Amino acid sequence: TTCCPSIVARSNFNVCRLPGTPEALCATYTGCIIIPGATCPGDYAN
Numbered sequence: 336t337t338c339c340p341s342i343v344a345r346s347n348f349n350v351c352r353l354p355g356t357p358e359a360l361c362a363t364y365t366g367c368i369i370i371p372g373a374t375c376p377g378d379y380a381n
Contacts, residue, residue, distance in 0.1 A: 338375035339367035
């Protein structure tokens with residue numbers, strides 16, 4: 336599960352994966368984290 340900070344940052348993160356851009360790439364661009372768990376803490380999830 337991938338969870339990003341800032342609702343704005345995660346917004347473009349989602350839009351990033353729309354054209355077929357790899358999730359991890361967009362995550363690296365947003366300062367986003369990809370954890371093995373299926374639920375992220377609210378500390379770093381927007």
